[PDB]
Amino acid sequence: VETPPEVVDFMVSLAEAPRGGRVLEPACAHGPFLRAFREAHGTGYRFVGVEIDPKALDLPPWAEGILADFLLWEPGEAFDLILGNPPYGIVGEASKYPIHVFKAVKDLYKKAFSTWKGKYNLYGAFLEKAVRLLKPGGVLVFVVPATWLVLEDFALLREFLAREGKTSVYYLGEVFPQKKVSAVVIRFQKSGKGLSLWDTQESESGFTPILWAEYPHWEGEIIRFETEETRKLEISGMPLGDLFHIRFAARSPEFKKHPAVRKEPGPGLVPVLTGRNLKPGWVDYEKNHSGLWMPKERAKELRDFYATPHLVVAHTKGTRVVAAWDERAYPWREEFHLLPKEGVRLDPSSLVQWLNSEAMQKHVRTLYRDFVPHLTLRMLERLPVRREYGFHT
DNA sequence: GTTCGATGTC
DNA sequence: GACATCGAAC
Ligand SMILES: NCCSC[C@H]1O[C@@H](n2cnc3c(N)ncnc32)[C@H](O)[C@@H]1O
């Protein structure tokens, strides 16, 4: 894992520190950020690097190297500037997640971080740790995944940043070669308040920040790339979430242990559908992509709504809206399942067409770009639906 | 119940 | 690029 030169340069161009100030690079290894900052701003600073793997710690003699777990590190003094690229990843069982540590250690992280939510991520913890290590007025500059702009797992982190100081977010995108992640650079200052969202332009000369929008009273709300168009479209109709209760499919384990489910096709048996069975406007009821089969009528045992024809919206087809009406009412292993709320009148055919329209695809693409490889509930809830498609009585 | 991916694999 | 994880985690 290395950070592209132009990314480091761009980040260094956003960093600031007072003469003789303390500068730190967490999870430094050989310290690419300390080197770049020193070459750009001089040597009149106290350079510190923290690395947990001794084989990786390799700093120049003018910097102070510290062997320790950054997240549980307790220095004597706070810092004026913290910059770097923290490790990303969920802490969990190796068969499913990338970060592997003793449960007791994960317990220590949970105890130390007030923003730790759900499965959380190593990068969220590094952000909180760095902010806590920041001296009043101090500045932090990290490059991390863009997922924290919209995901629930990071609601406390956003709320934390909003109340601890001022934040600027610069969208980069997939700037890490052979690394499947959409990234953003965050410049946080432990003072003031508000949020500034910037887009960037890449050139040979490097990255150039382009001011997109400003939210002076940001309190941790989901961060999006709004435009006059997205705004105009959102107030043109009722949020989809006000018309439908939104549930998710029962998970693979539930099906796998259910006595009515089989690993092979058979009479009276039907496949448990997945995102691969959902297409724009229709459902492929024949193909089996889950390796699971079961009698249709028994599906209501895992989720009661599996017995009722209803609207289905995709979750993992990237940032877009793919919907279809499940007229047969099949058992599903994935996707969103929307049940109309009491008094809600709708036109399935027309609503489906609206959800799959090009206009809708552009709407979500503009707002959430490629932060995450999904259409999340938070995104789905806010989709605007006008009277032509759904009406609340 | 439902969330998230320095995604997993073609 | 196509096309979506899928189950451990809370
Ligand atoms: N800055 C480069 C991206 S992160 C990878 C580096 O982070 C170091 N690292 C991972 N977890 C760490 C932790 N908890 N504390 C300090 N360094 C860490 C790794 O050893 C590796 O050198």
Side-chain angles (χ1 to χ4, degrees), chain A residues 60-331:
Chain A
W62 46 254
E64 195 183 320
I66 295 172
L67 282 171
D69 178 335
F70 179 67
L71 304 178
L72 304 170
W73 182 51
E74 279 309 318
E77 197 185 324
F79 300 74
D80 299 89
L81 171 70
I82 302 178
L83 38 32
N85 182 11
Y88 320 153
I90 291 165
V91 177
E93 168 177 339
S95 70
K96 191 67 180 186
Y97 303 105
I99 314 303
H100 319 148
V101 305
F102 283 132
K103 171 180 186 302
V105 172
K106 193 185 180 189
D107 282 330
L108 287 180
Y109 291 164
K110 294 186 187 175
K111 177 175 179 173
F113 304 116
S114 67
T115 66
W116 195 288
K117 182 183 179 181
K119 294 190 297 301
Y120 212 48
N121 197 295
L122 227 48
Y123 88 76
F126 267 70
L127 281 167
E128 193 195 323
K129 181 63 184 182
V131 169
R132 291 183 178 292
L133 288 169
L134 232 44
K135 300 158 68 172
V139 175
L140 169 68
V141 190
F142 272 12
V143 56
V144 297
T147 76
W148 68 279
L149 304 203
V150 295
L151 301 180
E152 277 301 339
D153 254 24
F154 298 101
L156 298 181
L157 176 63
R158 292 195 296 275
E159 283 163 28
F160 175 80
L161 295 170
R163 81 170 67 86
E164 291 290 318
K166 63 174 67 71
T167 307
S168 285
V169 175
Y170 310 78
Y171 174 82
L172 294 174
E174 290 194 60
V175 297
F176 291 105
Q178 69 243 181
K179 238 61 187 180
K180 193 158 295 177
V181 66
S182 182
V184 301
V185 161
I186 172 183
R187 177 183 189 293
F188 173 81
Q189 176 166 53
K190 208 169 186 172
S191 66
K193 61 167 183 174
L195 160 72
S196 295
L197 182 54
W198 313 66
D199 189 357
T200 62
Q201 159 176 294
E202 176 174 46
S203 298
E204 181 177 299
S205 66
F207 288 100
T208 293
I210 305 177
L211 181 50
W212 186 275
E214 288 173 271
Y215 302 86
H217 304 306
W218 182 59
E219 304 187 304
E221 295 86 351
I222 283 173
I223 296 176
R224 312 183 298 175
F225 275 98
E226 310 185 272
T227 62
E228 168 179 294
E229 297 302 300
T230 59
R231 288 241 160 152
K232 195 209 307 288
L233 207 290
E234 292 191 316
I235 88 277
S236 78
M238 181 179 263
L240 189 62
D242 285 352
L243 294 168
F244 297 87
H245 290 292
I246 302 170
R247 303 278 122 69
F248 204 86
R251 316 319 292 132
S252 63
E254 304 181 52
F255 282 104
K256 283 184 167 55
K257 70 182 184 182
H258 191 98
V261 175
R262 299 284 181 285
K263 317 282 292 193
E264 224 64 54
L269 298 182
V270 104
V272 179
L273 315 171
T274 69
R276 289 188 164 75
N277 292 94
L278 177 64
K279 284 72 166 55
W282 63 288
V283 176
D284 182 324
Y285 293 108
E286 312 311 326
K287 276 183 173 52
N288 185 302
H289 303 280
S290 67
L292 307 177
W293 282 269
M294 78 181 289
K296 210 184 83 61
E297 64 173 50
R298 292 260 261 158
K300 51 167 155 47
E301 281 163 52
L302 285 102
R303 290 294 185 290
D304 58 3
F305 56 76
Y306 282 144
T308 306
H310 63 272
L311 174 65
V312 184
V313 179
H315 175 52
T316 315
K317 287 175 183 288
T319 297
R320 46 168 154 263
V321 191
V322 180
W325 183 260
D326 180 349
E327 59 190 62
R328 300 191 187 185
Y330 263 46

